[PDB]
Amino acid sequence: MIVKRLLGWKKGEQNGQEEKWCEKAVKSLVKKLKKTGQLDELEKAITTQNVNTKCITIPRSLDGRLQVSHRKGLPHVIYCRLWRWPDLHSHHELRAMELCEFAFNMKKDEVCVNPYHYQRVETPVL
Amino acid sequence: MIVKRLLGWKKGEQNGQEEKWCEKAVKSLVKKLKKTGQLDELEKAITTQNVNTKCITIPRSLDGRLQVSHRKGLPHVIYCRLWRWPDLHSHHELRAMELCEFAFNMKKDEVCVNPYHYQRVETPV
DNA sequence: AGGCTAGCCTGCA
DNA sequence: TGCAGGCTAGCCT
Ligand SMILES: [Cl-]
Ligand SMILES: [Zn+2]
Ligand SMILES: [Zn+2]
Protein backbone atom coordinates (compact mmCIF):
# COMPACT_ATOMS: atom_id res chain seq x y z
CA MET A 1 0.00 0.00 0.00
CA ILE A 2 1.13 3.44 -1.24
CA VAL A 3 -0.48 5.21 1.75
CA LYS A 4 1.71 3.24 4.30
CA ARG A 5 4.82 3.74 2.12
CA LEU A 6 4.22 7.51 1.87
CA LEU A 7 3.50 7.66 5.66
CA GLY A 8 6.91 6.04 6.32
CA TRP A 9 8.42 9.29 4.89
CA LYS A 10 6.49 11.49 7.34
CA LYS A 11 8.54 13.98 9.42
CA GLY A 12 8.36 14.69 13.17
CA GLU A 13 7.20 12.76 16.24
CA GLN A 14 3.45 12.22 16.27
CA ASN A 15 1.16 11.01 19.04
CA GLY A 16 -1.77 8.58 18.42
CA GLN A 17 -4.24 11.30 17.37
CA GLU A 18 -1.84 13.05 14.92
CA GLU A 19 -0.78 9.72 13.36
CA LYS A 20 -4.51 9.00 12.50
CA TRP A 21 -5.02 12.53 11.07
CA CYS A 22 -1.75 12.25 9.03
CA GLU A 23 -3.05 8.92 7.57
CA LYS A 24 -6.33 10.64 6.60
CA ALA A 25 -4.38 13.57 4.93
CA VAL A 26 -2.32 11.02 2.82
CA LYS A 27 -5.45 8.96 1.95
CA SER A 28 -7.30 12.18 0.86
CA LEU A 29 -4.34 13.19 -1.46
CA VAL A 30 -3.89 9.60 -2.82
CA LYS A 31 -7.64 9.51 -3.81
CA LYS A 32 -7.37 12.88 -5.71
CA LEU A 33 -4.12 11.98 -7.58
CA LYS A 34 -5.35 8.46 -8.54
CA LYS A 35 -8.24 9.99 -10.56
CA THR A 36 -5.82 12.40 -12.44
CA GLY A 37 -3.01 9.82 -13.01
CA GLN A 38 -0.61 11.79 -10.73
CA LEU A 39 0.04 9.09 -8.04
CA ASP A 40 3.36 7.76 -9.52
CA GLU A 41 4.67 11.39 -9.58
CA LEU A 42 3.91 11.71 -5.81
CA GLU A 43 5.65 8.41 -5.00
CA LYS A 44 8.74 9.57 -7.02
CA ALA A 45 8.86 13.01 -5.31
CA ILE A 46 8.43 11.74 -1.74
CA THR A 47 10.45 8.51 -1.83
CA THR A 48 13.40 10.16 -3.72
CA GLN A 49 13.15 13.86 -2.56
CA ASN A 50 13.66 14.96 -6.18
CA VAL A 51 13.15 18.71 -7.08
CA ASN A 52 13.24 17.66 -10.78
CA THR A 53 9.77 16.10 -10.69
CA LYS A 54 6.59 17.45 -12.35
CA CYS A 55 3.99 19.60 -10.56
CA ILE A 56 1.65 17.48 -8.39
CA THR A 57 -1.66 19.38 -8.68
CA ILE A 58 -5.11 19.28 -7.07
CA PRO A 59 -8.05 21.69 -7.80
CA ARG A 60 -7.81 25.07 -6.02
CA SER A 61 -10.78 25.85 -3.66
CA LEU A 62 -12.37 29.38 -3.39
CA ASP A 63 -10.43 30.30 -0.20
CA GLY A 64 -7.43 28.06 -1.00
CA ARG A 65 -8.01 25.84 2.09
CA LEU A 66 -8.45 22.05 2.21
CA GLN A 67 -10.46 20.25 4.88
CA VAL A 68 -9.31 16.80 6.09
CA SER A 69 -11.01 15.08 9.11
CA HIS A 70 -12.39 18.32 10.67
CA ARG A 71 -9.17 20.33 10.20
CA LYS A 72 -8.76 23.10 7.56
CA GLY A 73 -5.48 24.36 6.09
CA LEU A 74 -3.58 25.32 2.91
CA PRO A 75 -2.80 22.03 1.09
CA HIS A 76 0.85 22.96 0.07
CA VAL A 77 1.45 23.84 3.79
CA ILE A 78 -0.24 20.50 4.89
CA TYR A 79 1.92 18.35 2.61
CA CYS A 80 5.18 20.41 3.12
CA ARG A 81 4.69 20.06 6.91
CA LEU A 82 4.03 16.29 6.63
CA TRP A 83 7.02 15.43 4.41
CA ARG A 84 9.59 18.18 4.91
CA TRP A 85 9.13 20.77 7.73
CA PRO A 86 7.13 19.47 10.76
CA ASP A 87 7.32 22.87 12.54
CA LEU A 88 6.23 24.83 9.42
CA HIS A 89 4.09 27.70 10.80
CA SER A 90 2.39 29.14 7.67
CA HIS A 91 2.33 29.76 3.89
CA HIS A 92 4.43 32.94 4.61
CA GLU A 93 7.35 30.56 5.31
CA LEU A 94 7.04 28.87 1.88
CA ARG A 95 8.24 30.13 -1.50
CA ALA A 96 7.82 28.14 -4.73
CA MET A 97 10.92 27.23 -6.85
CA GLU A 98 11.30 28.99 -10.26
CA LEU A 99 10.25 25.86 -12.23
CA CYS A 100 6.98 25.37 -10.29
CA GLU A 101 4.22 26.17 -12.83
CA PHE A 102 1.28 25.72 -10.38
CA ALA A 103 2.71 27.29 -7.17
CA PHE A 104 0.19 28.45 -4.54
CA ASN A 105 1.09 32.19 -5.00
CA MET A 106 0.15 32.01 -8.73
CA LYS A 107 -3.54 31.37 -7.77
CA LYS A 108 -4.15 29.23 -10.93
CA ASP A 109 -7.16 26.80 -11.24
CA GLU A 110 -4.84 24.02 -9.96
CA VAL A 111 -2.45 24.16 -6.99
CA CYS A 112 0.87 22.30 -6.76
CA VAL A 113 1.38 20.30 -3.53
CA ASN A 114 4.72 18.69 -4.51
CA PRO A 115 6.81 19.54 -1.35
CA TYR A 116 10.00 19.54 -3.44
CA HIS A 117 8.62 22.49 -5.51
CA TYR A 118 8.77 24.69 -2.40
CA GLN A 119 11.57 26.12 -0.26
CA ARG A 120 11.32 27.20 3.37
CA VAL A 121 11.96 30.89 4.03
CA GLU A 122 12.21 32.93 7.21
CA THR A 123 9.01 34.82 8.12
CA PRO A 124 8.90 38.05 5.99
CA VAL A 125 10.23 41.22 7.67
CA LEU A 126 7.83 43.73 5.89
CA MET B 1 -33.96 34.36 24.50
CA ILE B 2 -36.37 33.02 21.84
CA VAL B 3 -34.42 29.67 21.74
CA LYS B 4 -35.03 29.02 25.51
CA ARG B 5 -38.75 30.10 25.10
CA LEU B 6 -39.43 27.89 22.05
CA LEU B 7 -37.64 24.95 23.81
CA GLY B 8 -40.10 25.35 26.74
CA TRP B 9 -42.81 24.21 24.24
CA LYS B 10 -40.86 21.03 23.30
CA LYS B 11 -42.73 17.70 23.57
CA GLY B 12 -41.53 14.42 25.11
CA GLU B 13 -38.92 13.19 27.61
CA GLN B 14 -35.30 13.85 26.56
CA ASN B 15 -31.94 12.76 28.04
CA GLY B 16 -28.82 15.04 28.13
CA GLN B 17 -27.71 14.22 24.55
CA GLU B 18 -31.21 14.67 22.97
CA GLU B 19 -31.79 17.95 24.87
CA LYS B 20 -28.53 19.36 23.26
CA TRP B 21 -29.61 18.18 19.77
CA CYS B 22 -33.14 19.64 20.25
CA GLU B 23 -31.53 23.01 21.25
CA LYS B 24 -29.40 22.87 18.07
CA ALA B 25 -32.56 22.16 15.96
CA VAL B 26 -34.33 25.24 17.40
CA LYS B 27 -31.16 27.43 17.04
CA SER B 28 -30.76 26.26 13.36
CA LEU B 29 -34.46 27.20 12.56
CA VAL B 30 -34.22 30.54 14.50
CA LYS B 31 -31.12 31.53 12.40
CA LYS B 32 -32.93 30.76 9.06
CA LEU B 33 -36.19 32.59 9.99
CA LYS B 34 -34.39 35.67 11.40
CA LYS B 35 -32.85 36.38 7.95
CA THR B 36 -36.33 36.09 6.22
CA GLY B 37 -38.30 38.03 8.91
CA GLN B 38 -40.47 35.03 9.88
CA LEU B 39 -39.30 34.56 13.51
CA ASP B 40 -42.36 36.36 15.06
CA GLU B 41 -44.69 33.99 13.05
CA LEU B 42 -42.94 30.88 14.50
CA GLU B 43 -43.28 32.32 18.05
CA LYS B 44 -47.03 32.90 17.24
CA ALA B 45 -47.66 29.39 15.85
CA ILE B 46 -45.74 27.53 18.68
CA THR B 47 -47.17 29.55 21.62
CA THR B 48 -50.79 29.82 20.27
CA GLN B 49 -51.11 26.41 18.37
CA ASN B 50 -53.05 28.45 15.76
CA VAL B 51 -53.65 26.68 12.48
CA ASN B 52 -54.60 30.15 11.06
CA THR B 53 -50.99 31.37 10.98
CA LYS B 54 -48.93 31.98 7.79
CA CYS B 55 -46.59 29.38 6.25
CA ILE B 56 -43.22 29.24 8.06
CA THR B 57 -40.87 28.57 5.16
CA ILE B 58 -37.22 27.53 4.80
CA PRO B 59 -35.42 26.81 1.46
CA ARG B 60 -35.96 23.26 0.12
CA SER B 61 -32.79 21.14 -0.34
CA LEU B 62 -32.26 18.86 -3.45
CA ASP B 63 -33.13 15.64 -1.50
CA GLY B 64 -35.57 17.34 0.89
CA ARG B 65 -33.50 16.53 4.00
CA LEU B 66 -32.14 19.00 6.58
CA GLN B 67 -29.02 18.46 8.63
CA VAL B 68 -29.08 19.65 12.21
CA SER B 69 -25.76 18.96 13.99
CA HIS B 70 -24.74 15.57 12.50
CA ARG B 71 -28.25 14.17 12.00
CA LYS B 72 -30.22 14.36 8.73
CA GLY B 73 -34.05 14.28 8.40
CA LEU B 74 -37.10 15.88 6.77
CA PRO B 75 -37.57 19.36 8.33
CA HIS B 76 -41.39 19.29 8.68
CA VAL B 77 -41.00 15.89 10.45
CA ILE B 78 -38.19 17.37 12.69
CA TYR B 79 -40.27 20.37 13.84
CA CYS B 80 -43.64 18.44 14.03
CA ARG B 81 -41.88 15.89 16.30
CA LEU B 82 -40.29 18.67 18.39
CA TRP B 83 -43.48 20.64 19.07
CA ARG B 84 -46.43 18.30 18.46
CA TRP B 85 -45.79 14.56 18.06
CA PRO B 86 -42.62 13.22 19.79
CA ASP B 87 -43.43 9.67 18.56
CA LEU B 88 -43.99 10.72 14.94
CA HIS B 89 -42.19 8.00 12.99
CA SER B 90 -42.21 9.38 9.36
CA HIS B 91 -43.42 11.84 6.70
CA HIS B 92 -45.93 9.06 5.62
CA GLU B 93 -47.91 9.69 8.91
CA LEU B 94 -48.23 13.53 8.05
CA ARG B 95 -50.44 15.44 5.57
CA ALA B 96 -50.54 19.20 5.04
CA MET B 97 -53.80 21.13 5.73
CA GLU B 98 -55.74 22.56 2.71
CA LEU B 99 -54.57 26.16 3.52
CA CYS B 100 -50.85 25.23 3.52
CA GLU B 101 -49.38 26.81 0.38
CA PHE B 102 -45.80 25.42 0.91
CA ALA B 103 -46.52 21.79 2.03
CA PHE B 104 -43.61 19.29 1.92
CA ASN B 105 -45.53 17.07 -0.61
CA MET B 106 -45.94 20.06 -3.00
CA LYS B 107 -42.13 20.07 -3.57
CA LYS B 108 -42.00 23.90 -4.05
CA ASP B 109 -38.74 25.97 -3.77
CA GLU B 110 -39.64 26.68 -0.13
CA VAL B 111 -40.91 24.16 2.44
CA CYS B 112 -43.35 24.95 5.23
CA VAL B 113 -42.26 23.75 8.72
CA ASN B 114 -45.18 25.33 10.65
CA PRO B 115 -46.28 22.26 12.73
CA TYR B 116 -49.87 23.60 12.81
CA HIS B 117 -50.03 23.36 8.98
CA TYR B 118 -49.79 19.54 9.26
CA GLN B 119 -52.07 16.80 10.58
CA ARG B 120 -51.44 13.13 11.41
CA VAL B 121 -52.83 10.49 9.02
CA GLU B 122 -53.14 6.71 9.13
CA THR B 123 -49.87 5.02 8.07
CA PRO B 124 -50.37 3.92 4.39
CA VAL B 125 -49.39 0.32 5.52
C1' DA C 1 -29.17 6.19 6.05
C1' DG C 2 -25.22 7.95 7.20
C1' DG C 3 -20.23 10.06 6.45
C1' DC C 4 -17.09 13.81 4.44
C1' DT C 5 -16.10 18.45 3.01
C1' DA C 6 -16.31 23.16 0.06
C1' DG C 7 -18.66 27.01 0.53
C1' DC C 8 -20.74 30.12 3.38
C1' DC C 9 -20.99 33.01 7.52
C1' DT C 10 -19.08 34.53 11.44
C1' DG C 11 -15.97 36.58 15.18
C1' DC C 12 -11.00 37.57 16.27
C1' DA C 13 -6.19 39.79 15.86
C1' DT D 1 -8.32 43.61 6.65
C1' DG D 2 -6.63 38.39 6.61
C1' DC D 3 -7.22 34.60 9.38
C1' DA D 4 -9.75 30.82 12.02
C1' DG D 5 -13.41 27.85 13.14
C1' DG D 6 -18.54 26.27 13.23
C1' DC D 7 -22.25 24.60 10.47
C1' DT D 8 -24.44 22.15 6.70
C1' DA D 9 -26.19 21.12 1.45
C1' DG D 10 -24.49 18.66 -1.85
C1' DC D 11 -22.29 14.94 -2.96
C1' DC D 12 -20.63 10.32 -2.21
C1' DT D 13 -20.72 5.34 -0.26
CL1 LIG E 1 1.36 17.78 -14.03
ZN1 LIG F 1 4.99 22.61 -8.77
ZN1 LIG G 1 -47.80 26.01 5.57
Author numbering:
A (entry chain A): 10 to 135
B (entry chain B): 10 to 134
The authors write:
Smad proteins consist of an N-terminal MH1 domain, which binds to DNA, a linker region with phosphorylation sites for network regulatory inputs, and a C-terminal MH2 domain that is phosphorylated by the receptors and binds other Smad proteins, LDTFs, chromatin readers, and transcriptional co-activators and co-repressors. The receptors for TGF-β, nodal, activin, myostatin, and other family members are membrane serine/threonine kinases that phosphorylate and activate Smad2 and Smad3, whereas analogous receptors for the bone morphogenetic proteins (BMPs) preferentially phosphorylate and activate Smads 1, 5, and 8. These receptor-activated Smads (R-Smads) form heterotrimeric complexes with Smad4, which is required for the transcriptional regulation of most target genes. Focusing on the human and mouse Gsc promoter, here we identify specific Smad-binding GC-rich motifs and provide the X-ray crystal structures of Smad3 and Smad4 bound to several of these motifs. The structures determined here reveal that the β-hairpin is flexible and adaptable to bind with high-affinity several variants of the consensus sequence GGC(GC)|(CG), which we refer to as 5GC SBE.
The GC-rich region of Gsc contains a conserved GGCTG sequence, which resembles the GTCT-AGAC SBE. This GGCTG motif bound Smad3 and Smad4 MH1 domains with high affinity in the EMSA experiments. The Smad3 MH1 domain complex with the GGCT oligonucleotide was refined at 2.12 Å resolution (space group I41). Most of the hydrogen bonds with the GGCT site are very similar to those observed with Smad4. The main difference is that in the Smad3 complex no hydrogen bonds are observed from the ɛ-amino group of Lys81 to the G6 nucleotide. In this complex, we also detected several tightly bound water molecules at the protein–DNA interface that contribute to the stabilization of the interactions.
